[PDB]
Amino acid sequence: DISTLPRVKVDLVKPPFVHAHDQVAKTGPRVVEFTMTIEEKKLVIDREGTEIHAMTFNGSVPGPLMVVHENDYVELRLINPDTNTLLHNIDFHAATGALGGGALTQVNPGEETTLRFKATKPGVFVYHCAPEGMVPWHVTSGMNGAIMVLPRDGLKDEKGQPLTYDKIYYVGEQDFYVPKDEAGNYKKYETPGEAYEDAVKAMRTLTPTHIVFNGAVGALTGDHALTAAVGERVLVVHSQANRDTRPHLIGGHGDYVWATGKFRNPPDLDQETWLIPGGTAGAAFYTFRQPGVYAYVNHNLIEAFELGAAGHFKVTGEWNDDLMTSVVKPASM
Amino acid sequence: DISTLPRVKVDLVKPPFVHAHDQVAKTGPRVVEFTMTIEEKKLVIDREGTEIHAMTFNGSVPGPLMVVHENDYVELRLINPDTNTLLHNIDFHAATGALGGGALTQVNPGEETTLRFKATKPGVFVYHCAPEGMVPWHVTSGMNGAIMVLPRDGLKDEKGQPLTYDKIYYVGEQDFYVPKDEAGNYKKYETPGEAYEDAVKAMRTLTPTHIVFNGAVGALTGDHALTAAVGERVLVVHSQANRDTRPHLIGGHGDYVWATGKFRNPPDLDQETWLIPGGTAGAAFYTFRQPGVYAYVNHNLIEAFELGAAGHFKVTGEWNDDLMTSVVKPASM
Amino acid sequence: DISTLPRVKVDLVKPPFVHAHDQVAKTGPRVVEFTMTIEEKKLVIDREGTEIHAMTFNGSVPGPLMVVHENDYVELRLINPDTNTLLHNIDFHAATGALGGGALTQVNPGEETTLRFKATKPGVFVYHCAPEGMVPWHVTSGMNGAIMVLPRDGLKDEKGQPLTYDKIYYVGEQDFYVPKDEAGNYKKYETPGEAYEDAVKAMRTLTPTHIVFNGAVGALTGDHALTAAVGERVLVVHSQANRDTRPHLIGGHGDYVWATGKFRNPPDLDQETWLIPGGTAGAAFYTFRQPGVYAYVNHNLIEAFELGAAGHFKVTGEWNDDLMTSVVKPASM
Ligand SMILES: O=N[O-]
Ligand SMILES: O=N[O-]
Ligand SMILES: O=N[O-]
Ligand SMILES: [Cu+2]
Ligand SMILES: [Cu+2]
Ligand SMILES: [Cu+2]
Ligand SMILES: [Cu+2]
Ligand SMILES: [Cu+2]
Ligand SMILES: [Cu+2]
């Protein structure tokens, strides 16, 4: 009887950060209560000032990472304020039935709904809006995020021994299809409905104009670089709701990788790069061994360095000359 | 001595259905006799009336699913009637030698051939036509299907315990490259040879115009939706002879997935989405837990909902409110 | 203390061949010394005479395969002669820290550098140039190769038993983005810097003009076909530094495949086709069972047979009619 279970309210945080949780469940099964407010907003996605009408869960692209344990109940209050213009809904790939919830959560501006589902399968999973007849338009407007369903006993390696992260980040990767004029210039629009009228043609090229982490070119760089220390264990959850990606930590590895995101499977070891299919979340665990700057990319390097799918880590600590050293620094002789 | 083995004749059925077979082999090794007749035909592939010249095995796109057991012999009588205009052949990815059979099966209109191969490796496998110098043209005209080579003891899970399906469907996914005029309009042609003259240029864009299940937009919907009941175990075999796909059951999962199709490997568990590389067949097992409408898609949602890679299930039975429920239905307060 | 270890000098050979090595380490850990000389050169990449300015390690596309054992030290002397025009560097995906070495190896024309790293993880790995702000341009100009880090006890199967290859080949697959005029014609240029000015636009289409093995259409065919005999065990290492591929042996299989290249993981068995993500090396083991001509392709058959991602094997020996036979040769009746 679900009414006899504990309820716990979670307040979500902005990606790439992740709300506080326990890896190993410190209670029995609970109803975990989340609230997300839909926000349609203009967003500037590149250094040039290109503006799109983003469709967001909780004001961000991606939407925030939700975290529960296997056989918890997720109870989501989804709010569509009357300041918005479109109907929206939510499909959880973690959930079973009713198109992942999409059939039960259609909210017009000025409406709200509350969905409950049982998180029966452990893993990271995409969630995304999916209104009938407008599915790729909403997803590729940014209206997607992810949920992590941890095993109740936390993460385990390929031999059954604990894997415990010290830090967790959520990298949402977004393909955008900004329509162009005949010469190749990106259009701007006053409303999402105006933007929609060029959108299907732009999408059907299957060629994104931009591919970004955390909603913009350069978002995970500078003062917003990801951080770690030598010795620290970091889990990077990575989602792509619509298009394949191939994550790679430049100067590191995925020591343990669930490339398709599902923790009942043993992780792949020692990956350089891995394929997260479109419509999936994946997760990589790494223990840092060297300080300095890393880049974290989609390793189609055009998509990374020309279209925006690149972020940085800044890692503190002790350089290991056993692991790597410059024997003769660049010089002319 | 193969002449001492039983011969069994199979009559094939139209996809997405699958000819009757036994999961666990009820005889020893056999010579399993199949006949396929090649048919070049006009097909309408979308709601708009776009017509292509399809090159088919047995009148369908995809070609029918053939089913045998490991170490059976497949004996295929391939017929190319003189009503056709082109040379064709067949390459089985299940087979060993002679380009999978392609080097031994070149049939002009008015000819037939019979190929025999030993099915030495268990899995689902693509078969496709592959005439020298014209390979992608025939494949992307629809001339591809799949063969399932079951282990003699049937399917097993990641721990070695039986997996027994109640129902099986075959979803062939086809990328088409319909040539356009300068403004973007799709051309029609009177013959396959006329169509061929614009085909290489269209293919070289690497951008399909259409991506469909069972040969047309909407083919697996309406009166032709796939069906199941709550509690039923369903195996969905999915092939793509030329281009990657990423299958996803909207509102479900792949409980057990052989994403690259080969049953000596343990399946991946609890997949949301998986990557079937171009040139591969994959297979997903799911036990339905909720009634209602599901969609089954390529989860590049543009490819699904704009280009045609989407079908439906209609599932009967008892809704499970433990698994999912609307706590507060959409409303304004 | 690294100064107490043996040093061994390796002289590299041109792909698809691989320098001589021992599968099972016959010494303890060593410092393995390699020298590569950067060469910018014009290369003709197709049958039509299309010319690009290739940026090469050691004169070839791909760069040569380097082979060491786990916990050896790789010591690379990288030479950028003053006959070249650009700054280059090298990132090893096998290495840990400093962007895989890229941050420590920036060499102007007329300079050299020596990098040492510890090969702590077994597998095949991409290496590539990666100059800040010019990364995809150098990679997609051919400036990439691979390194194999063998386990000290050689390769093992999915049950822990030895896998010993008789022959090894390295297939580097290269996506090129040759800029076109308005009508679609490929441009030529006198220098790499002239070519660079159209390069970012060509890359941003995400649509290669050419996709080739060993640096040109048809490179691994004719007098340069790969060879084997019936019964021989062959390891094919395959890399793609920038873009996904899907290797397939036409008429064979990957009996054991590390599709993402890392030998601490059990191989996938009996693959028809597998996905090597862009930014990865993979490796397939096959024992030939039939003589004759095979093709080895990227199984996007357009990329194979129209854009150049196709090579051949010529295999000697005894045809096995149990495995495959023509029962009735093509004929009209
Ligand atoms: O490893 N980054 O190219
Ligand atoms: O789960 N379908 O977007
Ligand atoms: O198997 N080659 O299409
Ligand atoms: Cu929406
Ligand atoms: Cu979805
Ligand atoms: Cu054909
Ligand atoms: Cu094939
Ligand atoms: Cu370079
Ligand atoms: Cu790299």
Q: Are C315 and B293 in contact (CB under 8 A)?
A: no
CA dihedral A200, A202, A208, A211 (to 10 degrees): -70
The token pair that represents C256 in the structure block: 């054991």
Mutation target among B268, B273, B312, B326 for the A interface, most CBs of A within 10 A:
B273
The token pair that represents B5 in the structure block: 């083995």
CB atoms C244 and A244 under 8 Å: yes
The token pair that represents B157 in the structure block: 């899970």
Q: Around C137, how many Cα atoms within 13 Å sit in the side-chain half-sphere?
A: 20
The token pair that represents A78 in the structure block: 């989804």
Of A174, A312, A311, whose CA–CA distance to A240 is shortest?
Answer: A174
Chain C partners of B133 at a C-beta cutoff of 8 Å?
A: 305
Residue C320 neighbours by CB under 8 Å, 6+ apart: B97, C230, C289, C290
Q: Give the separation between CA C252 and CA A302, rounded to whole angstroms.
A: 33
Q: Please state the atom number of ligand 1 nearest to the C-alpha of residue C128.
A: 3
Q: Rounded to the nearest 5 degrees, what angle is found at the Cα of C81, between the Cα atoms of C76 and C83? A: 155
With tokens 């040769």, the residue in question is C329
Q: Give the separation between CA C25 and CA A68, rounded to whole angstroms.
A: 47
Q: Give the separation between CA A143 and CA A54, rounded to whole angstroms.
A: 8
Of A58, A8, A15, whose CA–CA distance to A33 is shortest?
Answer: A8
Distances (CA, A) of B291 to A2, B223, B316: 22, 17, 5
CB atoms C328 and B114 under 8 Å: yes
The token pair that represents C296 in the structure block: 């080895």
Q: Give the separation between CA B128 and CA B240, rounded to whole angstroms.
A: 10
Residues placed in the known binding site of B for Cu cation: 88, 93, 128-129, 138, 143, 299
Q: Give the separation between CA B272 and CA B251, rounded to whole angstroms.
A: 10
Q: Give the separation between CA C64 and CA C215, rounded to whole angstroms.
A: 12
Distances (CA, A) of C128 to A295, B304, C61: 15, 35, 11
Q: Which residues pair with C233 in a beta bridge?
A: C287
CATH of domain C1-151: 2.60.40.420
Q: Are A175 and A213 in contact (CB under 8 A)?
A: no
The token pair that represents B274 in the structure block: 């998986």
Q: Give the separation between CA A261 and CA A313, rounded to whole angstroms.
A: 22
Q: Which residues pair with A226 in a beta bridge?
A: A313
Q: Are C231 and C317 in contact (CB under 8 A)?
A: yes
Q: Are A283 and A171 in contact (CB under 8 A)?
A: no
Shortest Cα distance from B157 to chain A (angstroms)? 12
Q: Is C279 exposed, middle or buried, given 0-12, 13-18 or 19+ CB atoms closer than 10 A?
A: buried
Task: Report the SS3 class of residue B331.
Answer: strand
CB atoms B323 and A96 under 8 Å: yes
| Nearest ligand for residue C63 CA | 8
Strand residue runs (E) in B100-243: 111-118, 123-128, 144-150, 155-156, 162-163, 167-176, 210-213, 226-229, 233-240
What are the boundaries of each domain within chain B? 1-151, 152-318
Residues preceding discontinuities in chain A at C–N > 2.5 Å?
A: none
Q: Give the separation between CA B261 and CA B170, rounded to whole angstroms.
A: 13
- Phi, psi angles (nearest 5°) of residue A30: -135, 160
Of B68, B224, B234, B31, whose CA–CA distance to B152 is shortest?
Answer: B68
CB atoms C96 and A333 under 8 Å: no
CATH class of A152-318: mainly beta
Beginning with the edge strand found earlier in the chain, give each strand of the sheet holding B65-69 in spatial order: B65-69, B144-150, B123-128, B91-92
Q: Give the separation between CA B226 and CA B232, rounded to whole angstroms.
A: 13
- Phi, psi angles (nearest 5°) of residue B197: -65, -20
Distances (CA, A) of C182 to A148, C179, C244: 48, 10, 28
**Partner-chain residue, chosen from A259, A306, A333, that has the shortest CB–CB distance to C203:** A306
- Phi, psi angles (nearest 5°) of residue C224: -115, 20
Region of A138 please: left (phi>0), alpha (psi -120 to 50) or beta.
alpha
CA of B273 to the centre of ligand 2 (A): 9
CB atoms C246 and B244 under 8 Å: yes
Q: Are A245 and C243 in contact (CB under 8 A)?
A: no
Buried b (16+ CB within 10 A) or exposed e, B79-99: bbeeebebbbbbbbbbbbbbb
Q: Which residue of B has its CA nearest to C315?
A: B97
The token pair that represents B218 in the structure block: 């909407």
Q: Rounded to the nearest 5 degrees, what angle is found at the Cα of C32, between the Cα atoms of C27 and C33? A: 150
Of C180, C183, C154, C169, whose CA–CA distance to C239 is shortest?
Answer: C169
Of C14, C96, C25, C109, whose CA–CA distance to C63 is shortest?
Answer: C14
SS3 string of chain C? Answer: CHHHCCEEECCCCCCCCCCCCCCECCCCCCEEEEEEEEEEEEEECCCCCCEEEEEEECCECCCCEEEEECCCEEEEEEEECCCCCCCECCEECCCCCHHHHCCCCCECCCEEEEEEEECCCCEEEEEECCCCCCHHHHHCCCCEEEEEEECCECEECCCCCEECCCEEEEEEEEEECCCECCCCCECCCCCHHHHHHHHHHHHHCCCCCEEEECCCCCCCCHHHCEEEECCCEEEEEEEECCCCECEEEECCCEEEEECCCCCCCCCEEEECECCECCCEEEEEEEECCCCEEEEEEECCHHHHHCCCCEEEEEEECCCCCCCEEEEEEEECC
Q: Are B247 and B275 in contact (CB under 8 A)?
A: no
Mutation target among C290, C294, C300 for the B interface, most CBs of B within 10 A:
C300
The count of other CB atoms within 10 Å of the CB of residue B1 is 5
Distances (CA, A) of C127 to A246, A248, C242, C315: 16, 13, 11, 31
Q: Which residues pair with C293 in a beta bridge?
A: C314
Q: Give the separation between CA B34 and CA C316, rounded to whole angstroms.
A: 31
Q: Around B158, how many Cα atoms within 13 Å sit in the side-chain half-sphere?
A: 12
Chain C partners of A306 at a C-beta cutoff of 8 Å?
A: 136, 200, 203-204
With tokens 């890393």, the residue in question is A294
Residues with CB under 5 A from ligand 4 (ion): A 55, 88, 129, 138, 143
SS3 string of chain A? Answer: CHHHCCEEECCCCCCCCCCCCCCECCCCCCEEEEEEEEEEEEEECCCCCCEEEEEEECCECCCCEEEEECCCEEEEEEEECCCCCCCECCEECCCCCHHHHCCCCCECCCEEEEEEEECCCCEEEEEECCCCCCHHHHHCCCCEEEEEEECCECEECCCCCEECCCEEEEEEEEEECCCECCCCCECCCCCHHHHHHHHHHHHHCCCCCEEEECCCCCCCCHHHCEEEECCCEEEEEEEECCCCECEEEECCCEEEEECCCCCCCCCEEEECECCECCCEEEEEEEECCCCEEEEEEECCHHHHHCCCCEEEEEEECCCCCCCEEEEEEEECC
Task: Report the SS3 class of residue B165.
Answer: coil
CA of C261 to the centre of ligand 7 (A): 22
User: How many H-runs (helices) and E-runs (strands) does chain B carry?
Assistant: 3, 22
Beginning with the edge strand found earlier in the chain, give each strand of the sheet holding B167-176 in spatial order: B210-213, B167-176, B233-240, B280-287, B254-258, B268-271
Q: Which of residues 24-83 of A touch C (CB under 8 A)?
A: none
Going by their DSSP bridges, the two strands B111-118 and C51-57 should be labelled as unpaired
Q: Rounded to the nearest 5 degrees, what angle is found at the Cα of C277, between the Cα atoms of C275 and C279? A: 150
What's chain B's Rg over C-alpha atoms? 20
Q: Partners for C (CB, 8 Å, 3+ pairs)?
A: A, B
Buried b (16+ CB within 10 A) or exposed e, C28-39: ebbbbbbbbebb
Q: Give the separation between CA B174 and CA B167, rounded to whole angstroms.
A: 23
Buried b (16+ CB within 10 A) or exposed e, B256-276: bbbbbbbbebbbbbbbbbbbb
Which residue type occupies A78? Answer: L
Chain B partners of A242 at a C-beta cutoff of 8 Å?
A: 299-302
Q: Which of residues 255-274 of B touch C (CB under 8 A)?
A: 260-262, 264-265
Shortest Cα distance from B126 to chain A (angstroms)? 21
The token pair that represents C313 in the structure block: 């094997």
The token pair that represents C208 in the structure block: 């290669």
CA dihedral B257, B260, B266, B269 (to 10 degrees): -30
Buried b (16+ CB within 10 A) or exposed e, C141-150: bbbbbbbbbb
Q: Give the separation between CA C246 and CA A268, rounded to whole angstroms.
A: 19
The count of other CB atoms within 10 Å of the CB of residue A327 is 16
At how many Å resolution was this determined? 1.5
Mutation target among B186, B209, B240, B301 for the A interface, most CBs of A within 10 A:
B301
Upstream peptide bond of A109 is cis (omega within 30 degrees of 0): no
- Element at B280 (helix H, strand E): strand B280-287
CA of A161 to the centre of ligand 5 (A): 32
With tokens 């709550």, the residue in question is B230
Check residue B239 and report its DSSP letter.
E
Upstream peptide bond of A16 is cis (omega within 30 degrees of 0): yes
The count of other CB atoms within 10 Å of the CB of residue C191 is 12
Task: Report the SS3 class of residue B99.
Answer: helix
Q: Give the separation between CA A192 and CA A199, rounded to whole angstroms.
A: 10
Q: How many CB pairs under 8 A join A and B?
A: 169
Q: Are B40 and B73 in contact (CB under 8 A)?
A: no
Q: Rounded to the nearest 5 degrees, what angle is found at the Cα of B16, between the Cα atoms of B10 and B19? A: 20
The count of other CB atoms within 10 Å of the CB of residue A330 is 19
Same fold for the pair C1-151 and C152-318: yes
- Phi, psi angles (nearest 5°) of residue B213: -100, 135
Q: Which of residues 144-163 of A touch B (CB under 8 A)?
A: none
What's chain C's Rg over C-alpha atoms? 20
Task: Report the SS3 class of residue B194.
Answer: helix
Catalytically annotated residues of B: 88, 91, 93, 128-129, 138, 143, 248, 272-273, 299
- Among protein residues, the one with the nearest Cα to ligand 1's atom 1 is A250
CA B121 to chain centre: 19
Q: Around C253, how many Cα atoms within 13 Å sit in the side-chain half-sphere?
A: 24
Beginning with the edge strand found earlier in the chain, give each strand of the sheet holding A280-287 in spatial order: A210-213, A167-176, A233-240, A280-287, A254-258, A268-271
CB atoms C246 and B108 under 8 Å: no
Going by their DSSP bridges, the two strands A65-69 and A144-150 should be labelled as parallel
Q: Around C9, how many Cα atoms within 13 Å sit in the side-chain half-sphere?
A: 4
The token pair that represents B138 in the structure block: 């025939």
Distances (CA, A) of A149 to A5, A23, A60, A146, A254: 18, 10, 21, 10, 20
Upstream peptide bond of B62 is cis (omega within 30 degrees of 0): yes
Is A250's C-beta closer than 6 angstroms to any atom of ligand 1?
A: yes
Going by their DSSP bridges, the two strands B310-316 and B324-331 should be labelled as unpaired
Q: Which residues pair with C248 in a beta bridge?
A: C273, C297
Experimental approach was X-ray
- Phi, psi angles (nearest 5°) of residue A193: -65, -35
Q: Give the separation between CA A6 and CA A3, rounded to whole angstroms.
A: 8
Catalytically annotated residues of C: 88, 91, 93, 128-129, 138, 143, 248, 272-273, 299
Q: Are C290 and C230 in contact (CB under 8 A)?
A: yes
Q: Give the separation between CA A63 and CA A15, rounded to whole angstroms.
A: 7
CA of B190 to the centre of ligand 9 (A): 49
The token pair that represents A153 in the structure block: 């006993």
Distances (CA, A) of B135 to A76, B119, B143, B240: 51, 24, 10, 15
**Partner-chain residue, chosen from C117, C241, C244, that has the shortest CB–CB distance to A275:** C244
The token pair that represents C252 in the structure block: 């064979």
